[PDB]
Design a protein around this motif. Structure first.
Motif, PDB file in Angstrom:
ATOM      1  N   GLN A  79      23.589 -21.261 -42.912  1.00 26.45           N
ATOM      2  CA  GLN A  79      23.242 -21.984 -41.794  1.00 26.45           C
ATOM      3  C   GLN A  79      23.507 -20.920 -40.495  1.00 26.45           C
ATOM      4  O   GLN A  79      22.847 -20.933 -39.595  1.00 26.45           O
ATOM      5  CB  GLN A  79      24.403 -22.854 -41.702  1.00 26.45           C
ATOM      6  CG  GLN A  79      24.078 -24.285 -42.545  1.00 26.45           C
ATOM      7  CD  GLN A  79      25.560 -25.208 -42.300  1.00 26.45           C
ATOM      8  OE1 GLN A  79      26.493 -24.716 -41.866  1.00 26.45           O
ATOM      9  NE2 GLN A  79      25.361 -26.461 -42.729  1.00 26.45           N
ATOM     10  N   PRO A 137      18.831 -30.501 -41.565  1.00 30.16           N
ATOM     11  CA  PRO A 137      19.281 -30.724 -40.142  1.00 30.16           C
ATOM     12  C   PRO A 137      18.741 -30.025 -38.977  1.00 30.16           C
ATOM     13  O   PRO A 137      18.939 -30.205 -37.840  1.00 30.16           O
ATOM     14  CB  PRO A 137      20.659 -30.167 -40.239  1.00 30.16           C
ATOM     15  CG  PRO A 137      20.901 -30.331 -41.739  1.00 30.16           C
ATOM     16  CD  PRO A 137      19.618 -30.144 -42.570  1.00 30.16           C
ATOM     17  N   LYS A 188      18.378 -37.969 -45.234  1.00 36.18           N
ATOM     18  CA  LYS A 188      17.184 -37.579 -44.571  1.00 36.18           C
ATOM     19  C   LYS A 188      15.981 -37.371 -45.264  1.00 36.18           C
ATOM     20  O   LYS A 188      15.005 -36.588 -44.838  1.00 36.18           O
ATOM     21  CB  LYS A 188      17.810 -36.006 -44.095  1.00 36.18           C
ATOM     22  CG  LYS A 188      18.987 -35.951 -42.919  1.00 36.18           C
ATOM     23  CD  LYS A 188      18.432 -35.085 -41.917  1.00 36.18           C
ATOM     24  CE  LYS A 188      19.395 -35.021 -40.715  1.00 36.18           C
ATOM     25  NZ  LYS A 188      20.448 -34.230 -41.143  1.00 36.18           N
TER      26      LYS A 188
END
Ligand code: SAH
Ligand code: SAH
Ligand code: CL
Ligand code: CL
Ligand code: CL
Lengths: 9, 220, 220, 6
Positions: free
Chosen positions: B44, B79, B104
């Motif tokens: 990330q 995300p 998602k």
């Protein structure tokens, strides 16, 4: 994925 | 260096290996489930350095190569990107991905069931192409060619993220799972021959001394 | 240096490969049957340089390692030595050897059915140990160990003759038959670590340039 | 036995 390290002799 | 002949045997054995891997996060991690969280956090942070804003990779479309059930898609890509595509040679993993990517899954455009050495990414379609823990399953010749095709799949300012084990010295060919663990010189050599350059690279932190080191590369 | 993990799969694939190899000269030569005659000629000359004489290797006993049906024993060893022993992992080849060797077969002491990486040459028994086109079927670790055990199987002034493919640069791992084509530097390193010294060294001439070079080594 | 080159 991750792997155990090998040894060198 | 090493050349692999008999590539048919190489890829066939890998399919036999993954037919017995459970379609779970633990299976994706080769049982090293305790390392999934520090893997995700470093990925990330690494992605944030190269995405968003002028001159940097867009946030519209990403491709997850050797996705498995979508561990990286769930926690790293979805995300951030408006749409994500998964490609993996195992139908069982992609079937499970549809259930695993529940919250998602509406942003997942396609589940491509293909082997990477047979896969042609669409021309200039992706902002980010993510290749984690699967490059070791391609021969040098096939990885070189796949990285060149990925370069063609990038939109302008797009980047390839390569994340994998990097041996400290020399390469290791593991016949049980049909993988080659490459050292840094061989890896950088294949990146160069494919027409890519290292925009950035970072060693994975928080990983145990008992495991081969893990490195992230941003390529363009 | 390159390293092979999962030897179990390496040796297993080799047995599956040789189960489908005809117990004929053409099978031994891998459909290079026309190269058997120049191979025999070069080996006979090379052997004459290190056998028979003062301080030279005796002519009493020889061991043919990875003998197959005994092509080398029939044309190179049995004419020179009083007794020859064959060792190979395929009992089908050792069985056919009794036919193929014809009259020379009368001087065969024993047909040992063993994998070389599990075989221990009897102590101080052989004047010459011939290892031809089989060393590539052993991992670097197993080849080092086997050469050391061969050295212990030598009598006084005994020698080891090693004949195999040697790449000019860079190693080749062939998964179709589970063999490593080593190059000159790594092969010399493995010979050195085993505690052996190179007495003689000759490249096989008369072979097509499209073939990997073939070298003969006299070692003790 | 003998093998072809690359
Ligand atoms: N040749 C190939 N083509 C496409 N996928 C492959 C492949 N070889 C191995 N794979 C896939 O690569 C995955 C490796 S496990 C890694 C999964 C995922 N990248 C993660 O980090 O969580 C497996 O799902 C396996 O099915
Ligand atoms: N691990 C192993 N242990 C013992 N023999 C092996 C072996 N791997 C392969 N072989 C044998 O090695 C041979 C290679 S073909 C070479 C045959 C013979 N040396 C000649 O020059 O004509 C085959 O007979 C095969 O059965
Ligand atoms: Cl070590
Ligand atoms: Cl390492
Ligand atoms: Cl030497």
């Amino acid at each position: 994925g991750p792997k155990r390290r090998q040894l060198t002799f | 260096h090493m050349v692999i002949n008999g590539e048919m045997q190489f890829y066939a054995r890998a399919k036999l290996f993954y037919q017995e891997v459970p379609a779970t996060e633990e299976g994706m991690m080769g049982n090293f489930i305790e390392l999934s969280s520090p893997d995700i956090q470093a990925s990330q942070k690494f992605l944030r350095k190269f995405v968003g804003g002028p001159g940097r990779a867009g946030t519209d479309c990403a491709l997850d190569c050797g996705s498995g059930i979508g561990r990286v898609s769930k926690h790293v890509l979805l995300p951030v990107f408006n749409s994500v595509e998964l490609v993996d040679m195992m139908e069982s993993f992609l079937l499970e991905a549809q259930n695993y990517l529940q919250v998602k899954g509406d942003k997942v455009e396609s589940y491509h069931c293909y082997s990477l050495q047979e896969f042609t990414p669409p021309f200039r379609r992706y902002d980010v192409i993510w290749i984690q823990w699967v490059s070791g399953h391609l021969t040098d010749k096939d990885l070189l060619a796949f990285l060149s095709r990925c370069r063609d799949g990038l939109k302008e300012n797009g980047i390839i993220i390569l994340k994998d084990n990097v041996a400290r010295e020399g390469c290791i060919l593991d016949l049980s799972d049909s993988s080659v663990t490459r050292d840094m010189d061989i890896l950088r050599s294949l990146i160069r021959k494919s027409g890519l350059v290292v925009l950035g690279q970072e060693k994975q932190d928080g990983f145990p001394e008992q495991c081969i080191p893990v490195w992230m590369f941003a390529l363009h």
